[PDB]
Paper text:
X-ray crystallography confirmed that monomeric SQT-1C exhibits typical cystatin fold but only in very specific conditions, when crystallised in the presence of 19% dioxane. Interpretable electron density was observed for polypeptide regions R4-L48 and A93-N113 whilst residues D49-F75 were visible but less well ordered, indicating higher flexibility of this region. The SQT-1C monomer exhibits a cystatin-like architecture with five anti-parallel β-sheets and a perpendicular α-helix, showing that peptide insertions into loop regions do not affect the SQT scaffold backbone. The crystal structure reflects the dynamic nature of SQT-1C with higher than average B factors and less than ideal geometries. However, despite these shortcomings, the backbone fold and lattice interactions can be confidently discerned and have been extensively validated. SQT-1C oligomerisation state in solution under crystallisation conditions was further assessed by SEC, which revealed that in the presence of 19% dioxane SQT-1C is monomeric. However, in solution and in the absence of dioxane, monomeric SQT-1C exists in dynamic equilibrium with domain-swapped dimeric and dominant tetrameric species. However, such a model was clearly incompatible with the packing observed in the crystalline lattice, encroaching into two of the symmetry related molecules, in agreement with SQT-1C being monomeric in the crystal state. Melting temperature of SQT-1C was 54 °C ± 1 °C, as measured by changes in intrinsic fluorescence, compared to 79.9 °C reported for SQT alone, which indicated that the inserted peptides significantly destabilized the scaffold.
SQT is one of many engineered protein scaffolds: it is based on human stefin A (SteA, also known as cystatin A) that has three possible insertion sites for peptides, namely the N-terminus, loop 1 (L1) and loop 2 (L2). We show that inserted peptide regions play a crucial role in scaffold protein oligomerisation via domain swapping, leading to significantly different conformations and surface exposure of these binding epitopes in monomeric, dimeric and tetrameric forms.
Author numbering: 4 to 77, 93 to 113
């Protein structure tokens, strides 16, 4: 269950964070206007050869000025860490 290398984020990662934002807000009881999705890492759990599914995303989202969060999305939000800084490496954590 090794983690991928830190890759720059893409529009699909941005849409992933946009679609899991309601779950994040329901879990934190706080509304977020924009999550910029700075970077992301991937974690393969089972086998899907080319690419379709069976993966965990660890996305560093920028919520605001000096306000970053780390999201763990399976697309169901399985985890999150609040109050992270820009240079914090994305690491795996229990859900």
């Amino acid at each position: 269950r090794g983690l991928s290398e830190a890759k720059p984020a893409t529009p699909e990662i941005q849409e992933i964070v946009d679609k899991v934002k309601p779950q994040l807000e329901e879990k934190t009881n706080e509304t977020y206007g924009k999550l910029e999705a700075v970077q992301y890492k991937t974690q393969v759990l089972d086998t899907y050869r080319y690419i379709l599914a069976s993966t965990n995303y660890y996305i560093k989202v920028r919520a605001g000025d000096n306000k970053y969060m780390h999201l763990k999305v399976f697309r169901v939000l399985t985890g999150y860490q609040v109050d992270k800084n820009k240079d914090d490496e994305l690491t795996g954590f229990e859900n």
